[PDB]
Amino acid sequence: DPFARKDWYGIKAPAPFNVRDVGKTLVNRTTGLKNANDALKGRIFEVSLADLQKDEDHSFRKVKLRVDEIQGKNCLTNFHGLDFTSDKLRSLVRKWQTLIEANITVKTTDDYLLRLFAIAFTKRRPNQVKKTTYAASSQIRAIRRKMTEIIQREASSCTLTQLTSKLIPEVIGREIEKATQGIYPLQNVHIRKVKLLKQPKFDLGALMSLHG
Amino acid sequence: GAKLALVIKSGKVVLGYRSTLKALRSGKAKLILISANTPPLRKSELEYYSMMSKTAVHHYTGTNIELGTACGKLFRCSTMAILDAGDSDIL
Amino acid sequence: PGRGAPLARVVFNSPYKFKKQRETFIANEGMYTGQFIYAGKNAALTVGNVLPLGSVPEGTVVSNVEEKVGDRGAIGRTSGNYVTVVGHNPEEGKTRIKLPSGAKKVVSSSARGMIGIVAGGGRTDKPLLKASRAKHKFAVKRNSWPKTRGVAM
Amino acid sequence: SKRTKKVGISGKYGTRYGASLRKLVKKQEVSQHARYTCTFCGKNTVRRSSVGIWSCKACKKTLAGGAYTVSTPAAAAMRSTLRRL
Amino acid sequence: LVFGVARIFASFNDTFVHVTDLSGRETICRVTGGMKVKADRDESSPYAAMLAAQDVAARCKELGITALHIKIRATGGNGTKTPGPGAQSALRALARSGMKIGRIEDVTPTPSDSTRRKGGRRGRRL
Amino acid sequence: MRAKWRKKRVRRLKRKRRKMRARSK
Amino acid sequence: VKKRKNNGRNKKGRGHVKPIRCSNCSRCTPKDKAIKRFTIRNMVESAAIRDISDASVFAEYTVPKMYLKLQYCVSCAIHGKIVRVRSREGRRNRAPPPR
RNA sequence: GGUGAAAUUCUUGGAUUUAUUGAAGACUAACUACUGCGAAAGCAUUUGCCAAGGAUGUUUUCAUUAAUCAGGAACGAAAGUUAGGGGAUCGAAGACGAUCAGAUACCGUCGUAGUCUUAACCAUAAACUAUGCCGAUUAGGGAUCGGACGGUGUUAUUUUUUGACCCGUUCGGCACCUUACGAUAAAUCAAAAUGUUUGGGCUCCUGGGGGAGUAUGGUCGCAAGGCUGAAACUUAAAGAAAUUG
Ligand SMILES: [Mg+2]
Ligand SMILES: [Mg+2]
Ligand SMILES: [Mg+2]
Ligand SMILES: [Mg+2]
Ligand SMILES: [Mg+2]
Ligand SMILES: [Mg+2]
Ligand SMILES: [Mg+2]
Ligand SMILES: [Mg+2]
Ligand SMILES: [Mg+2]
Ligand SMILES: [Mg+2]
Ligand SMILES: [Mg+2]
Ligand SMILES: [Mg+2]
Ligand SMILES: [Mg+2]
Ligand SMILES: [Mg+2]
Ligand SMILES: [Mg+2]
């Protein structure tokens, strides 16, 4: 029975998540030459944004958390990546409408690379009679230029945590729709995925500032 | 490019290095075109002469082969002096 | 003679003695007489410059790489051969390179190298066609041609 | 008067060495002996001095390049990468 | 209320019920359909998937696992994208054996590239 | 017989015919 | 005899269309010629929906729906009874079956 | 793993499964359509550069400069060839395990050439709309793509312009639906109509079925082969579309 020799820890969410206790975990205990501190350092937890924010409108998003420090029986995890769920993404495509995908890579002020995948779909007019809602390729390229410009400019003037605070209400998608009303109106403008490429020198004051 | 085709049609230009310096010394030159692959010592000499004469310099993004073609000539040209702009707006 | 890749004699200034130090590098495809060659940690990343491997981004192409700091040139010195920088590891100062044979290797990040590809590439793509051309090829290298077959002895 | 039909420069080898080897060699014999345009003065006076060395008769400027061509595809691809990078 | 994740492999040849921690690094119990039948053809049977699900559900009690997030995947990627019959049996058994069910998601690997699948051009002439 | 492989059989037979002629030539 | 006006596909004016793989045969068939079904069904069967709602904790959870696009060749669709042989006059009716 | 069921195969050296990361090469899913571009073959991630193209609008210019084309030339899927690079997946040949009377097959595990790329060949496809190119006329109808025009009302911006949606007109396309004043042997066709009431212009091909796209000669190709292309002899049918069993 190789489970009496395994201890249980906890998961601590960073700011600005409403719920800080994400959940529990399991690992081998310290037994000499096998430290628990470096065995958990680097683990990735994929949890729903809905649970963290205690909302039912975020059920289709997931937040990845990365263990960076261990404080007794609690692992202070930091943000590792935002992404959708498979169920929501397949429901969003549909037919007879144009799908627009834009991608960019932004470097935050705290030496973080983030690749942001932005997704959008055309809007069916209230009085529309024709079946299809396609956009011309010139409009699509014009839309993509507006999307990339907004994503790059919006995330460049903020830190990593500030960007997460921006992602929670999906505020960035609001101005993308606003800027593209005069080109072609859109729906379900979101950030499909957020992926980090590298990290800066590991810090504790910034890490603890989120948990305190 | 196309502007250079108009000035050779109407205005007065000077092709070559030895005659471009002669134009610069007289002070009547007002524009200098320098090819991309001119010898760097010659390039620096032409720029220094223009600074003495307060003459504008354009660095043509092309070799002697392309610069000579732009003038309509069938020989390579490394530098130019535009004495009269003619009916062109290169100035 | 006997090499297959051209050499370039580069002249530097002695920083102590008021003298010109002649030195023969291995020329890269693109070098020319009258070119200025910069060697050092702070040298710009252009063809023909000699830089430490730690100050050169991954994916580049270098030649005359040295295994050990001070061993003035060991790897990638034939006609069309070159060394590719695969990745870095600045925690202890070590650089992972890829050799012409296809083997990966880890060397010091302070090891030097010349940006570019050695000159004379494609040399072995032309048939010699003649016993003379093989004879003259080896006559300036060493006495190893021709080889009698051992099974005929 | 358009001497020969197929061999071209490889007609100096007679009926020797095999047809395929004479085709493989003329691919580089034509490039080896051709005159190229100097990139420093524009004159068509660049010829191979020795293997990997190409000299311009007018500039008196020596260039290091490929064995049978002034530049190799690898060098050009390598050189364009640095400029864009 | 301790949460776990139950990664369920449902192919047409066999079924996997696999519970791990929130990260997947530590696995608790892992039993398959082929561990509960005597014939190879029954490895993917709905009955076998149910029997495997119960023993996983039984085993999770000792560690105190009370709630399970469920991830369902098929032999996706360079293959089919439809879960086998074992997926349904596992879901029903866990929901009845005394487990709280959290988030349910499909995690079948979807290729945007789809390298050359086996069989073509004429596929499986059956 | 399929015309695709009647063509293949004849084409194979033609190749053998040319070898027999080269042998005599 | 020409059996169908559109031959067997929809590529009039398209020249060439990249092929796809059959869902249960792996047959290499053109995308427009293939027989495509978009299926939207609950990820849990209707019989077992109630038990999933019982285990809901967290009792307002809505079971997600699987979103499949099945592509078949002619042989598989006919053998799988997705499509059936129709009469000479009934072949021309391009209307989906009513509900 | 895999199958109708199995077995070859991997596995306590931890197979399969779980998570993270890296490398390699290929490809570009869902969006994707009786939609678009291209002479055809073909063409689906983003960005920049380079050159090109049709339609539209025109109270711009030239003024017959045009149509089709024997020989002649450019491009030409896949497979295949030569020389390098690459080689993930799949997979001719080959080796096994099944099934079977046999199984040199369908099925399963491996697996070489190939599949990818640069330089050079090859020039054939059910290369099909089995329907040559130009031009005129002839029944209705609604969708859809690109452009233009007129009108109307919402929506975003706006020193009231532009985009999306709505209605209509017209030019040019991909097609489609009903009908026969017509056509065909019929299936069917807005062209396969305007043809015994038989003549708008041009090019190519066919003359019962085989032998046969074979033999030979020529020419092109590294080769595989391509283009051109018979005759002896044999035979009363072969064949097309529909009809009832
Ligand atoms: Mg002897
Ligand atoms: Mg075709
Ligand atoms: Mg394992
Ligand atoms: Mg389109
Ligand atoms: Mg795509
Ligand atoms: Mg245009
Ligand atoms: Mg033909
Ligand atoms: Mg035909
Ligand atoms: Mg007409
Ligand atoms: Mg229209
Ligand atoms: Mg319109
Ligand atoms: Mg069209
Ligand atoms: Mg006759
Ligand atoms: Mg006949
Ligand atoms: Mg019949």
DSSP string, A106-121: EEETTTEEEEEEEEEE
Q: Which helix (H) or strand (E) holds A36?
A: helix A36-40
| Residue tagged 């080109």 (tokens) | A183
Cβ-based neighbour number of residue E15 at 10 Å: 30
Q: Which residues pair with residue A65 across a beta bridge?
A: A45, A79
Query: How far is E2 from E4, CA to CA, in rounded Å?
Result: 7
| Residue tagged 């209307």 (tokens) | G95
For residues C123 and D51, the answer to whether their CB atoms sit within 8 Å is: yes
Edge-to-edge strand list for the sheet holding C104-108: C50-52, C112-115, C61-63, C83-89, C94-98, C104-108
Three-state secondary-structure class, residue C19:
coil
Closest chain C residue by Cα to residue D50: C6
Sequence letter at residue C34? G
For residues B88 and B39, the answer to whether their CB atoms sit within 8 Å is: no
G4-43 residues near strand H (Cβ < 7 Å): 5-7, 10-18, 20, 31-32, 36, 38
A21-60 residues near strand H (Cβ < 7 Å): 42-44, 46
Q: Looking at beta carbons, which residues of chain G come within 8 Å of A56?
A: 60
Q: Please, what's the b/e burial string for A170-194 (b: 16 or more CB within 10 A of its CB; e: otherwise)?
A: eebbeebeeebeebbebebbbbbbb
Q: Looking at beta carbons, which residues of chain G come within 8 Å of E102?
A: 57-58
Sequence letter at residue G54? D
Is the backbone of residue A21 left (phi > 0), alpha (psi -120 to 50) or beta? beta
Nearest to A45 by CA among A75, A18, A17, A15: A75
Query: How far is A184 from A141, CA to CA, in rounded Å?
Result: 11
The pair of three-digit structure tokens given for residue E23, joined into one six-digit string: 């990260």
Query: How far is A107 from C115, CA to CA, in rounded Å?
Result: 29
- CA atom of G1 to C1′ atom of H178, Å: 24
Query: How far is A169 from A166, CA to CA, in rounded Å?
Result: 6
For residues C73 and C18, the answer to whether their CB atoms sit within 8 Å is: no
Cβ-based neighbour number of residue C25 at 10 Å: 19
Q: Are strands E67-73 and E3-10 parallel, antiparallel or unpaired?
A: parallel
How far is Cα of residue E90 from the mean position of the Cα atoms in its chain? 7
**In sequence order, what are the residues at sequence separation of 6 or more whose Cβ sits closer than 8 angstroms to the Cβ of residue D2?**
none
- CA atom of B11 to C1′ atom of H79, Å: 64
Q: Are strands B12-15 and B31-34 parallel, antiparallel or unpaired?
A: unpaired
| CA dihedral for E86, E91, E93, E99, sign (positive or negative) | positive
Q: Is the peptide bond before A94 cis (omega within 30 degrees of 0)?
A: no
**In sequence order, what are the residues at sequence separation of 6 or more whose Cβ sits closer than 8 angstroms to the Cβ of residue B15?**
B68, B71, B73, B77, B80
Query: How far is E76 from G55, CA to CA, in rounded Å?
Result: 28
Helix axes E86-97, E46-62, angle to 10 degrees: 40
Q: Looking at beta carbons, which residues of chain A come within 8 Å of E21?
A: 25-26
Q: How far, in Å, from the CA of A174 to the mean position of ligand 2?
A: 47
The pair of three-digit structure tokens given for residue B90, joined into one six-digit string: 């290169």
DSSP for D2-66 reads: ---SS-GGGGGGTT-S-HHHHHHHHHHHHHHH--B--TTT--S-EEEEETTEEEETTTTEEEE--
**In sequence order, what are the residues at sequence separation of 6 or more whose Cβ sits closer than 8 angstroms to the Cβ of residue C39?**
C49, C50, C51, C112
Q: Where are the beta strands (DSSP E) in chain F?
A: none
Cβ-based neighbour number of residue B13 at 10 Å: 21
Q: Which residues pair with residue A76 across a beta bridge?
A: A12, A69
Helices and strands in chain A, H and E counts: 7, 8
Query: How far is C90 from A111, CA to CA, in rounded Å?
Result: 17
- CA atom of G7 to C1′ atom of H134, Å: 29
**Cβ contact E1–G57 (<8 Å):** yes
Determined by cryo-EM
Cβ-based neighbour number of residue G34 at 10 Å: 22
G23, G29, G32, G33 alpha-carbon torsion, rounded to 10°: -100
Sequence-separated contacts (24+) of D69-73 with Cβ below 8 Å = D69/C122, D69/D31, D70/D36, D70/D46, D71/C29, D71/C30, D72/C29, D72/C80, D72/C117, D72/C121, D72/C122
For residues C109 and C88, the answer to whether their CB atoms sit within 8 Å is: yes
**In sequence order, what are the residues at sequence separation of 6 or more whose Cβ sits closer than 8 angstroms to the Cβ of residue B86?**
B6, B7, B9, B10, B11, B12
Which nucleotide does the CA of E73 lie closest to, via C1'? H17
- Tell me the C-alpha to C-alpha distance, in Å, between residue G68 and each of A86, A104, G83: 12, 30, 18
Q: How far, in Å, from the CA of D25 to the mean position of ligand 11?
A: 62
Query: How far is A73 from A76, CA to CA, in rounded Å?
Result: 10
Nearest to D25 by CA among D74, D68, D79: D68
Give the closest-approach CA distance of B69 to chain D in angstroms: 13
Query: How far is G47 from E59, CA to CA, in rounded Å?
Result: 26
Query: How far is C113 from C45, CA to CA, in rounded Å?
Result: 11
Q: Looking at beta carbons, which residues of chain D come within 8 Å of C8?
A: 64
For residues G56 and G48, the answer to whether their CB atoms sit within 8 Å is: no
The pair of three-digit structure tokens given for residue A94, joined into one six-digit string: 């549909």
Task: Identify which ligand lies nearest to the alpha carbon of G17.
Answer: 2
DSSP for G38-89 reads: EEEEESS-GGGHHHHHHH-SSTTPPPPEEEEEEEE-HHHHHHTTSS----TT
| Chain H bases near protein Cβ (<7 Å) | 1-7, 16-20, 25-38, 40-48, 82-83, 86, 88-91, 106-109, 118, 129-131, 143-147, 153-157, 162-167, 174-178, 187-189, 192, 212-216, 224-225, 240-242
**In sequence order, what are the residues at sequence separation of 6 or more whose Cβ sits closer than 8 angstroms to the Cβ of residue A53?**
A17, A18, A19, A168
Q: Which helix (H) or strand (E) holds B69?
A: helix B64-70
For residues A50 and A61, the answer to whether their CB atoms sit within 8 Å is: yes
D51 φ/ψ angles, rounded to the nearest 5 degrees: -65, 125
| Proximity of residue G50 CB to strand H below 7 A | no
Q: What is the largest CA-CA distance in chain B?
A: 33
Query: How many residues are given for chain G?
Result: 99
G64 φ/ψ angles, rounded to the nearest 5 degrees: -70, 165
Give the closest-approach CA distance of A31 to chain G in angstroms: 37
Q: Where are the beta strands (DSSP E) in E74-126?
A: 100-106
Chains that touch C (3 or more CB pairs under 8 A): D
Three-state secondary-structure class, residue A31:
coil
For residues G44 and E91, the answer to whether their CB atoms sit within 8 Å is: yes
For residues B11 and B87, the answer to whether their CB atoms sit within 8 Å is: yes
Q: Are strands A186-196 and A112-122 parallel, antiparallel or unpaired?
A: antiparallel
Q: Flag whether residue B73 sits within 8 Å of chain D, measured between CB atoms.
A: no
A35 φ/ψ angles, rounded to the nearest 5 degrees: -80, 145
**In sequence order, what are the residues at sequence separation of 6 or more whose Cβ sits closer than 8 angstroms to the Cβ of residue A69?**
A41, A75, A76, A204, A207
The pair of three-digit structure tokens given for residue A66, joined into one six-digit string: 């990365």
The pair of three-digit structure tokens given for residue E31, joined into one six-digit string: 């039993």
Q: How far, in Å, from the CA of A117 to the mean position of ligand 8?
A: 50
- Interior angle at CA E30, CA E25 and CA E35, nearest 5: 155
**8-state DSSP, G97:** P
A93 φ/ψ angles, rounded to the nearest 5 degrees: -75, -60
- CA atom of G13 to C1′ atom of H136, Å: 26
B58 φ/ψ angles, rounded to the nearest 5 degrees: -115, 130
- Interior angle at CA B59, CA B57 and CA B62, nearest 5: 150
Residues 70-99 of E with CB under 8 A from G: 72, 80-82, 88, 91-92, 94-96, 99
Q: Do chains E and C touch (3 or more CB pairs under 8 A)?
A: no
**Cβ contact G65–A87 (<8 Å):** yes
CB-closest option in E21, E107, E108 to A26: E21
- Tell me the C-alpha to C-alpha distance, in Å, between residue A154 and each of A146, A163, A164, B26: 12, 9, 12, 57
Cβ-based neighbour number of residue G35 at 10 Å: 18
Alpha helical stretches, state H, A63-204: 86-93, 137-156, 160-167, 171-179
The pair of three-digit structure tokens given for residue C3, joined into one six-digit string: 């090499």
Query: How far is A202 from C103, CA to CA, in rounded Å?
Result: 33
Q: Looking at beta carbons, which residues of chain G come within 8 Å of E103?
A: 61
Task: Identify which ligand lies nearest to the alpha carbon of C151.
Answer: 1
Q: Looking at beta carbons, which residues of chain E come within 8 Å of A45?
A: 22-23
Sequence letter at residue A193? K
E34-53 residues near strand H (Cβ < 7 Å): 34, 39-41, 43
In this complex, which residue's CA is closest to the C1' atom of nucleotide H23? C86
- Tell me the C-alpha to C-alpha distance, in Å, between residue D41 and each of B39, D61, E51: 8, 10, 85
Sequence letter at residue F3? A
The pair of three-digit structure tokens given for residue A209, joined into one six-digit string: 């500032």
For residues E37 and E76, the answer to whether their CB atoms sit within 8 Å is: no
Q: Do chains E and A touch (3 or more CB pairs under 8 A)?
A: yes
Q: Which residues pair with residue B32 across a beta bridge?
A: B57, B81
Q: Is the peptide bond before A16 cis (omega within 30 degrees of 0)?
A: yes
Query: How far is A123 from A135, CA to CA, in rounded Å?
Result: 10
Helix%, strand%, coil% for chain B, nearest 5: 45, 20, 35
| Proximity of residue A89 CB to strand H below 7 A | yes
Cβ-based neighbour number of residue D50 at 10 Å: 11
- Tell me the C-alpha to C-alpha distance, in Å, between residue C65 and each of C46, D76, E11, E50, G68: 16, 21, 52, 63, 55
Give the closest-approach CA distance of E44 to chain G in angstroms: 17
For residues B63 and B5, the answer to whether their CB atoms sit within 8 Å is: no
For residues C110 and C124, the answer to whether their CB atoms sit within 8 Å is: no
Q: How far, in Å, from the CA of A130 to the mean position of ligand 10?
A: 15
| Residue tagged 């024709």 (tokens) | A130
- Interior angle at CA E64, CA E63 and CA E69, nearest 5: 100
Nearest to G58 by CA among A187, E102, A198: E102
